[PDB]
Design a protein around this nucleic acid. Structure first.
Ligand SMILES: [Mg+2]
Ligand SMILES: [Mg+2]
Ligand SMILES: [Mg+2]
Lengths: 468, 409, 50, 54, 40, 97, 48, 49
DNA sequence: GATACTAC
DNA sequence: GATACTAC
């Protein structure tokens, strides 16, 4: 037969050491992990002269609090407690006057009457970047900006009536002092609909008013304040570790493939550290596999970044990759680790395209967190019938993933599977529990979409707020 | 001096209800002599761990008494108006348990106190309730408040065996590796233009027949010299280290399975599936398992007309599956991926087929997938070399609390 | 000998509950955590409030 | 459902007798409902040592 | 009474006499919840 | 097992403590040195040990040499890596002479 | 000043010397009566 | 839980390539004895290893 | 002079 | 319309 295990849902650390498994209830019950020293987070709005008052009406609407549309499933649809007194962030969000800018209709028509698809997006991002840069060097500097877009713009930048708008604007806004956030018209005004490019005789749909606000306010708080809301709870006495995530992406001019990486570890106090690197790592062909020298340099940079903070070398290094560990890229890592005398090591490939599945006799799929040892490999179900939301959120059947360790990793597959399972609900972009991919993989993939349009000889920041 | 049997029957019923509570854990507790209404208080345990959630229970029993309107399902009963109010202003939920000694039968039902007066007439059923190990999550669901900010209940009930998508394959004793008679694509054209029986038990990689069958007759030895026969143990290539032999053995197995259908299970190319064929225009039935539980009609091929008129044909649906031919630690395996296929005039590949496939994949929950894999296992397990096994079974540790969720998945 | 003082304490607590009258009830051998469940009688006509 | 003081004083007397038996290092235990006008049984116990005298 | 309504729990119960006597005095409350200087 | 331990603060560096004393001979007039080592466990514990060797004699002054001072530091640093799998970031030495 | 009440020999609060030097003196108190070539134990329970 | 020692794969790889027989056994017993001694001098002493 | 079984 | 437990 086969040996099977079912892990419990891991806990998160938010507030005064308080622990829980739902980010929503944890934030509403104990507050964020690292509290803001100040009291006010200032927000600036850039866009049309109609969406600015929509953003303001949204802010004063959700300040008092909204209710959820859940009666049969109340854990799935919890209410929003508001932004004052009973706030889940212990802070107040204010739109300071003089930090807002509007785009004239005289120049919002010249955008719409350009036959080429490239220069229209270029002039749009140039106008927004110029307004933000003019806002930067003055006495009206905000903490986080909102670029709430109109509808007539969203027929050229998106519907194209063809490059990306987000990955270019986020690359041109790297030299500023504050991060930015993009919001469409439907989120702030619940009376309008936008078509969906092809088959335009329809309208896109979004969640209810209470589900949007949790994600939006959590992302805004993290972007504006700079302090992390929660982190995974460390266990009892265990060796110190440093997690590295590696992924690949494609440049948007041709077929060349590039690589990206992300680092994370713990602090001496109470706080997570998640960041990237201030460099690119070339192309070296079309293969989705890294070379030896760049891997050695990445390992050296991670070790130096750890030693600058902790004044000592770590005990173990955990590496995750969306590709098989070739015999050439598994030697540079070994050499770079043996130049510093780090003993415990681990190397794991995460595969998403696997066919085998587990079937039950009922009308509901298997539990979330099911592990089956398939002779040295691991079949993990990171999505399933969660017995906390009261149902299985979704349709058809969940998709499991395979974990394949290298032959030089000193750990059983069950411990590695549990460690991977504990690294799922770290995404600060959303507050949902049904997450499938680990945080290092998500962080390595999120950097690439912004690195695609950076260019040559420009400023690259290691701050994660410029990418999330 | 003298005691009637009625109090004896009541005490036996209370003791058996207490034992039935205890055999699942739950720490059933008795009551004093000053009882009025509630007959007991039950905690909730999870493998020996208390959870401090309690339910009030009232116990009723009978011997040789026939219930009102006793049938398979009806099972009506009448309550008392003066006692109900005692169950109205209460913190804990109150349940009622019925016990009969004649058939050793237990049943339970929770009294409703939502917003109005009680119905006073219980209409319990025997398919549900029945106070066994099943419906233990729907009983424990009456501990949490309706608001439910947090405070979930762990999945009570321990262990249920599931199965896997995989199929063991028992290889035959010999293959029929032959000499060099290579042909890139004309090797299929020579048998295509030939008047003999058509077979696809071969592949040209390095000049070898690669056949499971004897290359003596049935239009198989016209391409290779008949004197060259080789077969030793099939312990040199199917269990061999390098991967070229493995992924050519995979193609050999795929061709062998492709020949051994004979139901015109047509091979597509865009999805690598065998998509059935109806000989005649109506629904074509398939294998019935007949495992002493149901007849289990298959109704594989479906015919659907236009939205208003029954003359023109809209589309015809068929079943199909995709193989993978995977392996670990000897004992080559088969993986089955079920899929649907759409035709227009019976023999037509269609060209707007993607929205229908997406719309049907939006339906058809996991029970359909389990039934389809059981069907596809039992269909082709009824010449040689088809030594299929059974889907391996794994014993899980936690049962999914399907009882507390009503319906409409 | 601590079992006897635990039993004496539980019996005295039950007696103190029963003196004013609240229908206290003990538990079984494998009890863990909660030691008893008490009601509110409110001078006759008991109400299910534990 | 108004109870009387009679059941109250009966339960109080039984509990007090059980407590007095407990404080002397004895072992008293009450009976069920089917008892025949016969209450619980007491067992003579030494200092932490039962003697099985009932 | 163990506070079952706050967030994170609080240990170190401070039990004062008189006001917390389990007798007939407190029953409805029990049923209510149903620099200087120096030289060298 | 140990009854109690000193509470660590939040944000400190990992450290190891060494203590050095001196003592006369049994009946004669010579002076040997003695040492003890101390650090913190990975979980909830404490480590307080001496050594496994004698440090010989060098005369009648209560002072170490350049050869007996290195070996104590090597032993202290080697004891920490056997438990925490890495070197400490701080060394604290206390002495009377 | 923090390393004063970690003496497991006594339960007092008025200790004057820090723990490492006290342990060193306690070790050297009995290390002087061990003959040449004999065994030395690193366990602290044999010195306290 | 605290009385558990794991030899790293690097150490077992180091004692897999010493062509002296006596020497490799010496390093193996030295490694195990050092781990056991570190267990002995601590506060997690077991009764049998 | 009130509370618990069950059958009518 | 059947048999048991407390006391007044
Ligand atoms: Mg975002
Ligand atoms: Mg009853
Ligand atoms: Mg002493």
């Amino acid at each position: 037969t086969f040996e099977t295990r079912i892990f419990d849902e891991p806990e998160l650390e938010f507030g005064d050491h308080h622990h829980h498994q739902d980010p929503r209830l944890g934030l509403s019950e104990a507050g964020p992990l690292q509290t803001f020293l100040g009291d006010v987070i200032k927000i600036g709005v850039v866009g049309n002269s109609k969406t600015i008052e929509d953003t303001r009406k949204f802010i004063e609407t959700v300040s008092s609090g909204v209710e959820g549309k859940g009666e049969k499933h109340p854990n799935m649809h919890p209410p929003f407690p508001g932004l004052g007194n009973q706030s889940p962030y212990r802070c107040r969000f204010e739109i300071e006057d003089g930090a807002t800018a509007a785009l004239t209709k005289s120049k919002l028509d010249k955008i719409g009457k350009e036959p080429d698809h490239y220069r229209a997006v270029e002039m749009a991002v140039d106008e927004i970047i110029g307004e933000l840069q003019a806002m930067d060097d003055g006495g009206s500097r905000p903490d986080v900006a909102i670029i709430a877009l109109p509808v007539k713009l969203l027929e050229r930048v998106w519907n194209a009536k063809a490059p990306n708008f987000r990955g270019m604007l986020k690359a041109k806004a790297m030299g500023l002092s504050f991060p930015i956030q993009i919001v469409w018209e439907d989120v702030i005004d619940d009376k309008v609909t936008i078509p969906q490019k092809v088959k335009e005789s329809s309208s896109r749909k979004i969640q209810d008013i209470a589900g949007r606000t949790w994600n939006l306010m959590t992302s805004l708080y993290y972007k504006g304040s700079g302090r992390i809301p929660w982190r995974r709870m460390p266990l009892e006495g265990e060796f110190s570790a440093c997690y590295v995530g590696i992924s690949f992406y494609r440049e948007a001019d041709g077929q060349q493939l590039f690589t990206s990486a992300a680092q994370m570890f713990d602090e001496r106090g109470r706080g997570f550290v998640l960041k990237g690197r201030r460099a690119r790592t070339e192309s070296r062909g079309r293969h989705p596999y890294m070379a030896r020298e760049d891997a050695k340099k990445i390992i050296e940079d991670v070790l130096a970044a750890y030693k600058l903070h902790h004044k000592t070398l770590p005990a173990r290094v955990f590496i995750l990759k969306t590709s098989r560990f070739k015999d050439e890229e598994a030697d540079g890592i070994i050499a770079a680790l043996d130049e510093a005398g780090t003993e415990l090591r681990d190397l794991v490939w995460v595969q998403e395209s696997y066919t085998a599945r587990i079937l039950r006799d009922g009308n509901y799929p298997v539990l979330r967190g099911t592990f089956v040892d398939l002779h040295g490999k691991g079949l993990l179900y990171t999505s399933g019938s969660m017995p906390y939301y009261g149902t299985y959120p979704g349709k058809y059947d969940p998709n499991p993933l395979l974990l394949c360790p290298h032959h030089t990793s000193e750990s059983t597959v069950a411990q590695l599977a549990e460690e991977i399972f504990s690294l799922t609900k770290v995404n600060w972009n959303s507050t949902q529990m049904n997450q499938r991919l680990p945080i290092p993989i998500r962080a390595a993939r999120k950097v690439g979409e912004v690195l695609k349009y950076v260019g040559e000889g420009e400023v690259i920041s290691a701050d994660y707020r410029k990418y999330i | 001096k003298k005691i009637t049997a009625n109090q004896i029957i009541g005490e036996i019923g209370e003791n058996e209800v207490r034992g039935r509570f205890l055999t699942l854990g739950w720490q059933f507790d008795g009551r004093s002599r000053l009882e009025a209404g509630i007959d007991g208080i039950a905690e909730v345990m999870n493998e020996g761990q208390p959870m401090a959630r309690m339910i009030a229970v009232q116990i009723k029993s009978t011997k040789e008494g026939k219930y009102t309107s006793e049938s398979d399902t009806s099972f009506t009963y009448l309550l008392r108006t003066q006692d109900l109010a005692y169950w109205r202003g209460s913190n804990l939920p109150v349940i009622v348990v019925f016990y009969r000694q004649s058939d050793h039968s237990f049943y339970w039902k929770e009294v409703s106190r939502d917003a109005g007066p009680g119905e006073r007439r219980l209409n319990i059923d025997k398919v549900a309730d029945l106070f066994n190990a099943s419906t233990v999550n729907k009983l424990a669901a009456l501990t949490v408040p309706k608001t439910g900010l947090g405070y979930y209940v762990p999945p009570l009930g321990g262990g249920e065996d599931a199965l896997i998508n995989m199929l063991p394959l028992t290889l035959p004793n010999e293959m029929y590796i032959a000499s060099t008679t290579y042909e890139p694509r004309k090797a299929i054209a020579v048998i295509l233009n030939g008047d003999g029986p058509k077979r696809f038990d071969w592949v040209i990689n390095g000049g070898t027949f690669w056949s499971f069958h004897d290359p003596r007759t049935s239009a198989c030895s016209e391409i290779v010299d008949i004197d060259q026969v080789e077969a030793i143990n099939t312990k040199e290539l199917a269990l061999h280290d390098d991967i070229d032999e493995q992924n050519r053995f995979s193609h050999l197995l795929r061709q062998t399975l492709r020949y051994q259908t004979d139901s015109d299970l047509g091979w597509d190319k865009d999805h690598k599936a065998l998509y059935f064929r109806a000989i005649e225009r109506e629904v074509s039935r398939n294998f019935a398992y007949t495992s002493s539980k149901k007849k289990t009609d298959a109704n594989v091929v479906s015919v659907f007309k236009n939205s208003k008129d029954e003359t023109r044909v809209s589309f015809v649906r068929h079943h199909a599956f995709s193989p993978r031919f995977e392996l670990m630690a000897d004992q080559w395996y088969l993986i089955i991926t079920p899929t649907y296929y759409y035709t227009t005039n019976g023999y037509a590949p269609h060209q707007f087929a993607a929205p229908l496939l997406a719309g049907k994949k939006r339906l058809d929950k996991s029970a359909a997938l389990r039934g389809q894999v059981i069907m596809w296992h039992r269909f082709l397990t009824q010449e040689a070399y088809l030594m299929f096994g059974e889907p391996p079974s794994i014993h899980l540790d936690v049962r999914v609390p399907e009882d507390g969720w009503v319906k409409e998945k």
